[PDB]
Structures are given as C-alpha cells and as structure tokens.
Design a protein around this ligand. Structure first.
Ligand SMILES: Cc1cc2nc3c(=O)[nH]c(=O)nc-3n(C[C@H](O)[C@H](O)[C@H](O)COP(=O)(O)O)c2cc1C
Ligand SMILES: Cc1cc2nc3c(=O)[nH]c(=O)nc-3n(C[C@H](O)[C@H](O)[C@H](O)COP(=O)(O)O)c2cc1C
Ligand SMILES: Cc1cc2nc3c(=O)[nH]c(=O)nc-3n(C[C@H](O)[C@H](O)[C@H](O)COP(=O)(O)O)c2cc1C
Ligand SMILES: Cc1cc2nc3c(=O)[nH]c(=O)nc-3n(C[C@H](O)[C@H](O)[C@H](O)COP(=O)(O)O)c2cc1C
Ligand SMILES: Cc1cc2nc3c(=O)[nH]c(=O)nc-3n(C[C@H](O)[C@H](O)[C@H](O)COP(=O)(O)O)c2cc1C
Ligand SMILES: Cc1cc2nc3c(=O)[nH]c(=O)nc-3n(C[C@H](O)[C@H](O)[C@H](O)COP(=O)(O)O)c2cc1C
Ligand SMILES: Cc1cc2nc3c(=O)[nH]c(=O)nc-3n(C[C@H](O)[C@H](O)[C@H](O)COP(=O)(O)O)c2cc1C
Ligand SMILES: Cc1cc2nc3c(=O)[nH]c(=O)nc-3n(C[C@H](O)[C@H](O)[C@H](O)COP(=O)(O)O)c2cc1C
Ligand SMILES: Cc1cc2nc3c(=O)[nH]c(=O)nc-3n(C[C@H](O)[C@H](O)[C@H](O)COP(=O)(O)O)c2cc1C
Lengths: 183, 183, 183, 183, 183, 183, 183, 183, 183
C-alpha cells in the first residue's frame, strides 16, 4: 500500500509523527512537508523537521514538481493530509495546485484514489465548512482530529493513538492502537 | 451573564464538566442534560449524572417544556451545546425542537442570542458538514472540540483546558486556562 | 480598541495612510503591508514604505506567521483591509490564508470579529462581485472606496477624508472628518 | 455612436456632467434625468438641472414613455447609468421598468446592446452586491465610480476625469483624459 | 436610543400606535408614515393620521429624501417597520428604495444597524416567504405580529401589549407590558 | 364565474378588448386599467379608454386600494393580466403590490386562485424569463400572446380570436372562437 | 453574411417563409427543414416543402451530418430557429445534437456565433421557460413570435412582417418591413 | 474483467480501435457502435465498420434492446464511451436512454459500476461542461482525449497509445503503452 | 490585433510554440511564461525557455506587476492561456490574480476582452469542470487541446497545427493550417 503523507502548517503535527511511525513497516510511505509545517514541527515537537523526514520510504520537497508524484501517470493508493491547514483546505477545495501537496490531492480526486484530510481549526467559519463539504461531496474523507473519550485516555499519547488508529481504520489497515467502543 | 449549557449524547462530556466548573462563580449557568448524555457521563466519567447537575445555578429536564427557558419571552445571553451529538446537530439545523435543548437553540436563533455548538464526530460526512454550514451561515459558532498543541499539553487536562478556554474566549469571558499562542 | 490595518497591492494606498494617522492616538493599531503594497506606496505616495510603518503601534511582515495576530487565541476588535486588491479579495472569500493578512481576516470571520474590506477596482467583473457577496453574506462589511460629493469636496484631501470618516463611522469611532449629509 | 446617458438620484452627478461634455462633439447623446437626480444636481452642482439638459443632442422626461427610446424597434449603441442609485440598480436587476431609464436598460439587455451602470453607495450590502452580480452575469458592465491614484491626481477634476476616461474606454472611445498606467 | 418607526399600509396600525406611546419617554423616535398607512390609520383607528405624528420626537414624509435619515452618514440604532405591507416587504428584500422607509431599511442593512420588520398578511404565499427568508438571512429580525395566548389575554389591549412588549424585548428595552411565560 | 381582467401598458391591448366582449354575458368581470394602458388603448385602438370601461360588470382605478378586490377576505375565481407589461411581470414575480393589479395577483397567489398572465415583449431577456419561470413554478399560467397558424387565419381578427379562445380554454369556458387542431 | 435558417415542427412556419424571402438577395442563407416541419409547411401553407427549399442559397437534410455545417471548423455568422418547437428548444438547451439543426445550434454556442430561437407555444410551462432561460443566460437571443400592435396591422401580412423585421433587426440587417414605434 | 466499449459519432475513433486491440486478450470486451460512428470509422479510418466489430468478444447493435446488456440483472465491470459525442454526453447526463449505449451507461450509474466517458469536442460550451460536471459529480470518470507531451511522442501512434494507456490505467489494467512521467 | 499569450506549467507547451510562430507576422504578441512553464519548455522541447521569448513582440516576467499589461487602463484584444495548468485554471476562475497571467485574465473579464483558456489535464475532476463551467458562463472560451482526426493527421505536426488553427479560428484570424471538415 502506497500512502502519501502530507504535513501542512497547522497545529497538531504530532498526529503526523505518530501516523508515520505506526506506518513505518506496514506501507510504502511518501512524505511531503510544507515550509510552514517545518517551522511548526520545530516549535511544537522541539525537534528539527529532518527528524520527521527519516520515517518515510521517500521524501519530496513541496516545490519539487518534477517529483514522480506530480503526475497521474504514476500511481498511489491514498493521500493523508495531516494536519490540514485552512489554507491548504482552501487550495484543495478550489483546485489551486500551486505546490506538490495540493497537486497530489488534485491527482487523487481525478484518478479516484482515496483522499483523507484532517483540517485543524477551532472554531470553523463558513468558508472552512463549505470547503470541507465540497470535498466530502466529491468523495474525500474529511476527518478533523476530534478525539473521543469512551476509551478513557490516561495521557496525551492515548489521545494521539485514538486519532491515528481511526486514520488507519479509514485506510483499511488493521490496528489495535486504541480501545474500541465494544472494548 | 446567563449561559445555557446543554450536554447531548456524544463522546467527550469531560469538556462539559470542565466548562461547568470554570463557569461556577463567573456566570449564571442553566444546565440541561439529555437522557443519552446521562448514560455517557456514567460510562465515560464513572460518576452518576446527578454529580454534574450540582455544578449549575439551575437544572431542567430535557423533556420539561414548562421550563422558563422554553419561551423567547424569557431571556438568556448564550447557549453552549457541548458536546453536540450528530442527532442534535441535525435537529438544530432543521428546527426539530422536540426537546428543551433544541428548543432553546431555536430560541437563541430567533432572538439573535449567541449559540455555540461543539459537534463531536470523526470523520464527518456531508450531512454533518451541511448541517454545520447552515448553522454557521445563520450566525451560530460551530466549534467542534479540536485541540491544538502549540501550548504543548503535558496531560489530558491541558487538552481539556485549551478547548474550554477557547469556549470562554468566544463567550467573552477572560481566562488564563491555556498558554496562548504568543505564550 | 485594537484594529488591524492591512494594506494590499491596489491603487489608493493614500486611504490607508490617512486612516492610519487619524487612528494614531485613538486606537491600538497593528499594521501589515504586503510586498505589492510596498511598491505601490513608493509609486503612488513617492515615499518609502517604512514611512507608513511608523504610524502604527505594531507592525508585522506579511509572511511572519509567528506573529501573535496569526492565532485566534489572541484577540483584536476589527480588521480593515484598505485598499483590498482583487487577489486578496479572492483569497479572503475562498479562505486561502497564505499570508498574515488573509489569515487574520479568516480569524476575524471564525472569531466573529468585525471585518472591513475596501476592494479597489473598476470595473468589477462577476468574480469580484461574487467574492464580495459571499463575504458580505458572512457579515463582512464590503466597502469599496466610492466617494460621494454632497459634502462638496474642494480638493483631493476632502475626498480622502470622506472615505476615511466613513470607515471610522463603521468602526464606531466618533469623528468630524467630513461634512455629513445633514450638514 | 448613439449613447443614452441616464442620471439617477445618487451622489456624484458631477461624473454625469463631465461625461456629457466630453461626449458633446463625439457621439449622439440622448439624456434622461430622474426627478431625484434633478434635486441632486441642484444641491451638489449648485446649478439648475436644465443646465445639464442642454449638453445632450436629445432629452426625454423620465416619465415620457411615448419617447422613441421606449421601444426596441428603435436603435441605440450604449446606455450609461451614471450615477446609478441603489433604487435604480434594484429596478434594472429585477426588470421593474416603471420609468424610461429602467425601460431603456431593459431594452438594452433584450436587444443585446451595451449597458454600463455606475452604482454609487458606500458601504454596499448583500442586496446591492447580488443585484450587481446578476446584471454583470447578464453582460452589463458594472462600474461603480472607484477612482485610482496611480495617475497622481492633483485636484478633484483629475479624479473626475479618470472615472470618465475609463467610461469612454469601455465605450470604445479614444481619449487622453487621464494619465494611463504606463504613463 | 434612536429608533426609526415606519408605518406602511397594512392592517394592524394599532401595533404602531401602541409601540409609539410606550416608546415616548424611553427613546428618541423618528417616525415615517406612508400615504397608504395614512388612509389605514384613518379607517382602522378612526383618528386622523396627524394624531399619530405627534407621538414621535421627529417626523419625515415618506417622499422627503432630503431628510437626514436618508444617508448612512447620519446614525440611528434601530428601524421598526410596523406593520410591514407585502409591497414594502418586497421593496426591502429587493433593495427598491423608492421612498424614505425602504431607504432607511437599506441603510440599516449596509450600516449593520438593527432592522425589525413585522409583515402582516394571511395567508403568506411563496413570494412573501422568500422575501422574509432573504431578509432574515441578512440579519433582519422578521417578526410578523403573531400573538400568543399563554398570558391569557382578557381583551384586545392585552394582545396588542404582548406584541409590542416582544418588540421592545428585541430592541433591548426592559418592559413589563405582558405576563411572561414564567408568569 | 368572477374574473378580474387587468390591462397593463404593453402593446396588444386589442387582446384585452376582445376578451372583455366575449366574456360580457358569460362571467362577472371586474376590470382594472393602468394609467399606461389607458394611453396605449388610445394610441393603438384610437378609442378613449372609457370605451373599454363599459364592457365590465365593475371597474376600479389602479390606485383605489379601498376597492373590495384589494383584500383576500373577498373572493374571485380568476385573474387575467392581458397584456402584461415587463414592469408588471416584474412586480408580480417579486411581490411589489404597489397598485391594485399587482395586489390582486398577489392575493390570487396566496389564496390559490387561478392567475393568468400574458407578457408581451420581443425578444425576452433573462430577467423576463426568470420572472415568468418563478411565477409558473408557483402555479400561475404564463401565456404570452403567441398565435398559431394551423387554423389558417384569414385576417387580424382570426389571430385575436385564437389567442382569446385559448384564454377561455384555460379559464374553463367553452367556446368556438377558433378552428381547433382537429378542425 | 451567412445565416443558417432552421425550420422545426411548430405552428407558424409562415414566419420562416417570409424571413427566407426578405433574406434572398441580402445574405447567404443555408436552410434546414426537419421532417416534422415538412408536414407543417404542407398543412399550414398548402404548398409542398420543396417550394421553401428553393429560397435558400443552400439546403441540407436534417439527418445529413456530413454537411459542412456540422463542424465548427466551418464558419457562419448566425443561426435562426424559426419557428422553434418545444422538442427542439429542449434539445438545444440540453445539448442533444441528434440532428443537424441542434448540432449547428450547439456549434454556434461553442464558437460564440449569434443564435436566435423563436419558440412557438402557448401557454408555456416551467420546462419551456427554464430551457429558454438557460439558453438566454448563455447568450442566445430567445425570441418567441409575439407580435405587437402599435404599428396598427391591417392584415395577417403586417403581423408577419413585424415579426420578421424584428428578426432582421437582431441580425443587424437594415429594413423597413414595419412601421417602427416612432412611426 | 468485462468491459463495454461504446463508440459514438465523434472524431477520434482511432482511440476506440487502439483500445479494442490492446484489450483483445486481457478482458472480455462487449462492443456497441452507433450508426453515426459507423460512418465516422469509414471516413476517418478508411475501413468498413465491420472490421472494428471483430476485435470484440461480443457485439450488439445500438438499437438491440433485447441484448443482455440492456438490464441491470446482468453484470459487467466497466463501460468506456470512446469517443463520446456531445449528443451522447447530453443523453447520458440527462438519462435519455434511447439506445443501448446510453442504457448501459444509465445501468452503470444505478448499479454503481465504473463509467468512463471521453467527450471529444473543441471548444466546449457551457452545456457540455455542465453535462460533464453532473456526470463527474455522480462518480463517472470524465476523460476527454487530451494528450500530453512529456513522453515526447515521435508520431501519431505515440499520442494514441498515451491516451489509451491512461484509459487502461483508470480501468486498473497494467500496461507499458507510454513512457510515464518518471520515465 | 494585440494578443497576450500566456504559457503555464502544463504538458503540451508545443501548442504555445506553434501558436507563437504562426502569429509572428500577423499580430502584436505579448508573451508571459510562468516559472513552471519555463521548466516544462526545457523538459518537453529540449530548448531553453529564452528561445520561446524571442518569438513575441514583447515579453514580461510573470511577477512583473509594473508591466503595462497589469492595468485595465491599457488595452489589448485577446488573451490566450496555452496550455492552462489546473492551478492557473483555478486562479482565473476564483480571481486569485497573484501573478501577471491571472491579472491579465481578470482584466480581460472586467474589460470584456476575449479570453481563451486551454486546460490540459486527463482525466478532469469535478473541480476542474466547475472552474471551466464558471469561466465559460462568464464568456471565456474554454478550449482544452483535444485534437480531431477527420483531417487524417500524418504526424504529430498535423495534430499541433489542427489545434493551433482552431485557436486562430476563435481569434478571427484566417488560416489554412489544417484540412477543414468540408476538406
Ligand atoms: C504556530 C502556528 C500555528 C498555526 N496553526 C494553524 C492551525 O491550527 N490551523 C490553520 O488553519 N492555520 C494555522 N496556522 C497558519 C498556517 O500555517 C498558514 O495559513 C500557512 O500558510 C499554511 O500553509 P501550508 O498549508 O502550506 O502549511 C498556524 C501558524 C502558526 C505560525
Ligand atoms: C457510548 C456512546 C458514544 C457516542 N458517541 C457519539 C459521538 O461521539 N457523536 C455522535 O454523533 N453520536 C454519538 N453517540 C450516539 C448518540 O448518543 C445518539 O445519536 C443519541 O441519540 C444522541 O441523542 P442526544 O443528542 O439527545 O443526546 C454515542 C452513543 C454512545 C452509546
Ligand atoms: C501600479 C499597480 C496598481 C495596481 N492596482 C490594482 C488595483 O487597483 N486593483 C487590483 O485588484 N489590483 C491592482 N494591482 C495588481 C495587484 O497588486 C496584484 O494582483 C497583487 O498580486 C496583489 O497582491 P496583494 O493583495 O498581496 O497586495 C496593481 C498592480 C500595480 C503594479
Ligand atoms: C442628497 C441625496 C443623496 C443621495 N445619495 C444616494 C446615493 O449616493 N446612493 C443611493 O443609492 N441613493 C442615494 N440617495 C437616495 C436616492 O435618491 C433614492 O433612493 C431615490 O429614490 C433614487 O431614485 P432614482 O434612481 O429614480 O433617481 C440620495 C438621496 C439624497 C436626497
Ligand atoms: C384597508 C386596506 C388594508 C390592507 N391591508 C394589507 C395587509 O394587511 N397586508 C398587505 O400586504 N397589504 C395590505 N393592503 C394593501 C397595501 O396597502 C398596498 O400594497 C400598498 O401599496 C402598501 O404600500 P406601503 O407599503 O407604502 O404602505 C391593504 C390595503 C387596504 C386599503
Ligand atoms: C407605445 C408603448 C408601447 C409599449 N409596449 C410595451 C410592451 O410591449 N412590453 C413592455 O414590457 N412594455 C411596453 N411599454 C412600456 C410600459 O408601458 C412601461 O414599462 C410601463 O411602466 C408599464 O406600466 P404598467 O404595467 O402599470 O402598465 C410600452 C410603452 C409604450 C409607450
Ligand atoms: C400540426 C402540428 C402543430 C404543432 N405545433 C407545435 C407547436 O406549435 N409548438 C410545439 O412545441 N410543438 C408543436 N407540434 C409538435 C412538434 O412538431 C413535435 O414535438 C415534433 O417532434 C417537433 O420536432 P422538430 O423540432 O424536429 O420539428 C405540432 C405538431 C403538429 C402535428
Ligand atoms: C465527420 C463528423 C465528425 C463529427 N465529430 C463530432 C465531434 O467531434 N464531437 C461531437 O460532439 N459531434 C461530432 N459530430 C456530430 C455527431 O456525430 C452527431 O451529434 C451524432 O448525432 C452523434 O450521435 P451518436 O452519439 O449516437 O454517435 C460529427 C459528425 C460528423 C459527420
Ligand atoms: C512535467 C510536469 C508536467 C505537468 N503537467 C501538468 C498538466 O499537464 N496539467 C496540470 O494541471 N498540471 C501539470 N503540472 C503541474 C503544474 O505545473 C503545477 O500545478 C504548477 O504549479 C502550475 O503553475 P503555473 O500555472 O503558474 O504554471 C505538471 C508539472 C510537471 C513538473
């Protein structure tokens, strides 16, 4: 399974870090990190962004349009935008593929490949909601990171693993990352 | 400030508990708890629902339409639906005021009083998103509990206090519940 | 009163200069100037852009996302985009917060803070008009600089002071910058 | 070139006066002045409205439906509504041809003749914007008088000549009324 | 508090009379009465319309566009159209400010001032309902005079005072004009 | 059968004259003639408008809102607007009942009585077509006078009788005014 | 000027006959006649359809897709569908180019050439009106044959010449076929 | 894999010929050729249409509704309409299953089977674009034959093989028909 | 004839090269090449981008907003975006004039000058199709490079000359670049 993981400049890049490590030995992972996300990884995770780069089977710069990912002639199974900034949510919904992340999302939509986006914002305004609705109407899986608590998390890590486990659920990847509802 | 806190049957009732206690001595709080939320409080917080009832200046049953809240002739400043189930999100968006919670939301909209809803679901489908968009277009503040991490939470409690602090921000209530972006 | 003044690359930056000086001692003013507007200030006002920078209580670069303004956790009262380019009008209407100006407009909309935009173009096409209509429908005050003449302006300065006085009117700031209709 | 100039009751009738005199010897000009505009000409230009009447090759009263203009069987090249009141903008957008001005605009639309409207209002509300969008979508040129300043106006007259020069530009009439962008 | 009371030609002008007298010493009231409403006041209240004129701090004729109210440069707090004819409901919804009443409603919408309309008709058709929906979507308070009976009215006067008390409620004016729901 | 015949200022008032005389002894006919139609009757039929007035069982001035027709409490079976000007088509579609004709059309729609309109214009623009579509969607019978020729008309009179016969067909009135398709 | 005249199966083919003869020596006319129109020409004009065929510079069968007209690579100035059946109005509006007539209309729309349609039906339903509105919105000239009477027609021929003269007006062809409004 | 290949009357039937031969020994292919496409195969490929018929595992006439394909009770995996005429694009988008091709497309949509359409036209008008948008919104893969050149085609054959290879890509059929982007 | 040729980063820049050379001595050509297109010219045409620069009467950098083209006060006859990337298609449709190419397209739309766009993508998704539909609805000529084969191309060059000949057709430029349908 070939999964494109796209990190954009919004709070909660810890979700992307955890997803990348639970995917390490279970899927071919291509990684793209926007310039804004590089600064957020540094600020929120107190590690340099290149530390995230090594958890993927391949990495491409967000401005490297000569990447093989930038064409529908090349194939992949799924895209995960985690977290998804409001800027990138807008670009995906309107087709403004000015970087590699939005280009591979636009490719996923035209080639009918699975597209998961995790918009992180609070509150949402009507522009965010309409951009999400449009993409959901086109078959994208709109999945803002909204933890539940029926698994009774004991720490931050339990919350992160719930969100990531649900992402793997949507990807069709079996996991036991969280205590499910039936316990 | 008179605030109506409405707890519906969705995961994350811990947000409602924390909001009620930080509001205890700062606002007149009226509380409504749906039957489904009573079971979720018991399951997720391992306390009986009547323990939540005592944190409010007033309580009304979700089926008590003779409550003073059930009429626009009586006044309040804000409604907070936390967490907001998809069922109640649907009812508010379509005006199906079959219980007291949806009735006071419908009152808030016709009387132009502040309405905050916190829909808790993951992923969202297009029905959820359109119901949220409609309500946001009418002036409701659509605020799913989506924690950020730039405050670097050290525990579950730091995550809950971020979400609740943002709710107080929207209510216009000064608080220091979380480390803000400028630190 | 904390007002964010955003200057974008469209003709009529003299409006922004006049607004900044009548606001100098009456409000806490944060200023953002886009790169395009820096060139227009130089071309139309024959002064370097840093001369405008000093009229504000604070300045932030349009690419400084680490500015405190870039988060809803921090507070302000109003945003004024003067003048508003068609590019920035598009970005605000579609949520493409790729710079600090659009990000604080998007924040204003989600946090329900006052947003004033002054699109400067002639003629308008249907894309401009639909972008303005959408934002007006969301509660933004869409205010292209369209001077009136019932005050009988004697010079360019009287025209600029009419437009700026109307902006202060919308902000709720008492002023006598122009001869009102009742004279 | 036969141009219908329609003056309605909104501020800025000086634009109509200047347009009429630069058109004097370059086009066959038919003029209509609404009753409200007659009062505004008097108040803003301190001249009687009949002084404007003499600058046209023909004049018709706004209630003279027996005018030849009131039928599509008769021909013209363009209509200019300057300035355009919000009332007349509404009437044109909804087809309420209760006077000669709106009737010749409705004729222009059905006969596919050029229609220019210059709505003068500040701010615009959503009703104005939707009425303009509808007309722009039908091929009308929606042109609120929004002066630019890259020509560095030295006086009110330079501002008026910029707006009027742009109107002549849209009409296809060569002019040197303003210093263009390339200088 | 400066309130514009606008009486249009629909049945139920008794509501406007009662509102004007309960507002007499509690707000600065400007009054406009349409020609049709003058005849309805005479027919339904068996008093000459000038008897209503004296209950206001100021009066303006519906055709007096030189009134200070006819410009956004002048300020007011709220407009109440009571009762609102279907003709005037249409004009407000479509922006056809052909008289002073609709002009001050259009001003209220562009200046974001409170607008209350009380359309009186039975039944409503789809044109009425869409005109009301549009205005409600723009933030107007659409308030047809629909008395309730939980206050157990003993006479016509109790019904009129309920409707008027609710109008004062929306205006933010404290009153005891009716027995509220909580009794 | 009580039929309201409304003549508005558009070409083809001969249709209204012929309809009124074929209805003379077969239905109770109430007649309203707009001021514009009075001039068109004079110009196109070379007879004074009062000659048309005598063919009806009752006549009311277009500004006589005290007419019994102006209330839904009074009853009628059908309204025929023949011919229908574009101005009146607009007013009916938008609910702008500023005269008795549009008021009785609006009454017909709310009371669910039969409404026939015969818009006379050529070509139609998109505003006309949308106004007709809206009214047709509400159940009005939109019937521009478009003669057919399968009856092989020998003179103008045969064309007028075809159009009028079709109107009687829609009214449910048996007639032999034209040679039907089956001959 | 190269004009495509398309006759479809609706009443009023006399309009097409008259248009073809007034165009004989003033434009290059290509003619297409549908099978249904061939029967209507015979029934309504009591002449064989081949009599109409000779009035054109070229004729093509409605099923001859190898005609040069059937490609946008070949050029023409205008299409006139007279009369336009409801079936063909539907096909044009929905793009169902199953014959040569609809194909050249679809070509006219993609190549931005003038398209005139004359739908003949009475009354219209909402399907007709929406099909006309869509085409008018795309720039087609929607022109049902609706004669006026201000020219005071003395016979059927005067009515036919009014309609045809208006068609030539829209085509930009000078004519004196009817007494215009200014007489 | 059972694939229905449908050839309609538009230029570029060479794409259908090439697709049929690369599919010969890799899938069960059912073929339908419209009458118009039979003429285009003859004109553009200078071979009789029956030469194309032999490349399929089964053939059915476009009017043979007794074909097993004409019912959803029978199964297939994918439909490819190559090339897709504007007429057939319209019929599919509107559900006008008047032949076997459109019927199996309508079946594919109701049974949720893969539907690929390749509309061939240049330019497109708004009717084409809306018909494509509607079908794309329903899950059809809208794929006009638009060759790329990053594979550096050396001849017409390289262009045809790129388009066909992309079709096989969408079908999930591995192929090396073109030099992919990563070379 | 002044034509703006805009090359954006999509496959098929050979179309732009061929169009520029057939336009060399027949029109005043202004050229803009985006940074992405510069790389694609190098990769697909194996020539440096400056080789394309010399075929135009003028060249401007895509970031040179001080170019005379960047203002509506300066005039041109037509814009051709060939090829049009999905990113630039999005920007034009939404008005995001962040570079000179989109700015001159936005100018073309407001000044009602001819705009031709040639989006190159396969397949299209619903975002592409809606962006094209919107622009086509505004009067842009949406012309993806979709070659036909009725001219029986013998080589790649014949395909390129068909597409370019059709572009000249839309521009109103006589050419014999391809064998037309009538041969
Ligand atoms: C510390 C920080 C946190 C941010 N958090 C968010 C966020 O949570 N949601 C959001 O939409 N934007 C957020 N932003 C702003 C975005 O980073 C900004 O819009 C940026 O342009 C996104 O670009 P990208 O999608 O290419 O990463 C944040 C910015 C900073 C500096
Ligand atoms: C343990 C549990 C957790 C649930 N969590 C959610 C949830 O997170 N979001 C949601 O929409 N519904 C959730 N539901 C289902 C809702 O409770 C259900 O739709 C209910 O009818 C809501 O009614 P109420 O809004 O009146 O409380 C949950 C149900 C259970 C038993
Ligand atoms: C001298 C000059 C004047 C301009 N005037 C306008 C204008 O009046 N309206 C507009 O929409 N764009 C105008 N532009 C183009 C914008 O500056 C351009 O779209 C830019 O990208 C806007 O970016 P910004 O909003 O970040 O400032 C002008 C450009 C120049 C060089
Ligand atoms: C002094 C004065 C200035 C006005 N200015 C405007 C204006 O700038 N914009 C506007 O929409 N209406 C304005 N109005 C109100 C309009 O004149 C009013 O709506 C009138 O009915 C327009 O009618 P008309 O379009 O037939 O001229 C103004 C009125 C007055 C008395
Ligand atoms: C006695 C009487 C009662 C009326 N009642 C109503 C009414 O209740 N609702 C309504 O929409 N129109 C009613 N009308 C008709 C309106 O007065 C008419 O449409 C008028 O043009 C409204 O104009 P205005 O809004 O400027 O007052 C009534 C008319 C009369 C004579
Ligand atoms: C001689 C003459 C003929 C007219 N013919 C038409 C017409 O055929 N269609 C139309 O919409 N307006 C026509 N008009 C204009 C209308 O009369 C005008 O819009 C008027 O305001 C209609 O008002 P009413 O509907 O109250 O009669 C004509 C005007 C004149 C003077
Ligand atoms: C005598 C006769 C008259 C007709 N008149 C009309 C008409 O006036 N309007 C219409 O829409 N259809 C009319 N029809 C039906 C159309 O001819 C029918 O829908 C036909 O399929 C149109 O096909 P065409 O557009 O290819 O000519 C008439 C049919 C007949 C036999
Ligand atoms: C030589 C020729 C080429 C054609 N090319 C096209 C084309 O490229 N696109 C199109 O929409 N129609 C084209 N047509 C017209 C269609 O064949 C026509 O609309 C036909 O009815 C389609 O029917 P079908 O889809 O059942 O094959 C062409 C016609 C001919 C004769
Ligand atoms: C080799 C190559 C080929 C590309 N082909 C296309 C294409 O055919 N269609 C498309 O939409 N984008 C294509 N792209 C991606 C665009 O270049 C990218 O979205 C870019 O940002 C467009 O920017 P521009 O419009 O300013 O040139 C291609 C990229 C590369 C590297």
């Amino acid at each position: 399974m070939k999964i494109i993981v796209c990190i954009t400049g919004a709070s909660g890049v810890i979700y992307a870090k955890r997803l990348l490590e639970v995917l390490k030995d279970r899927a071919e992972v291509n990684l793209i990190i926007s310039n804004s996300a590089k600064k957020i990884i540094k600020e929120e995770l107190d590690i340099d962004w290149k530390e995230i780069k090594k958890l993927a089977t391949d990495y491409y710069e967000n401005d490297d349009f000569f990447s093989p990912l930038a064409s529908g002639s090349n194939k992949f199974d799924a895209v995960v935008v985690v977290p998804c900034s409001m800027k990138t949510l807008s670009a995906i919904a309107n087709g403004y593929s000015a970087n590699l992340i939005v280009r591979v999302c636009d490719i996923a939509l035209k080639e009918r490949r699975k597209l998961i986006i995790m918009p992180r914002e609070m509150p949402f305004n009507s522009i965010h909601l309409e951009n999400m609705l449009k993409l959901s109407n086109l078959g994208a899986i709109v999945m803002p990171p909204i933890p539940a608590f029926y698994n009774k998390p004991k720490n931050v890590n339990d919350i992160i693993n719930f969100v990531v486990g649900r992402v793997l659920d949507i990807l069709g990847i079996d996991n036991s990352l969280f205590k499910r509802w039936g316990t």
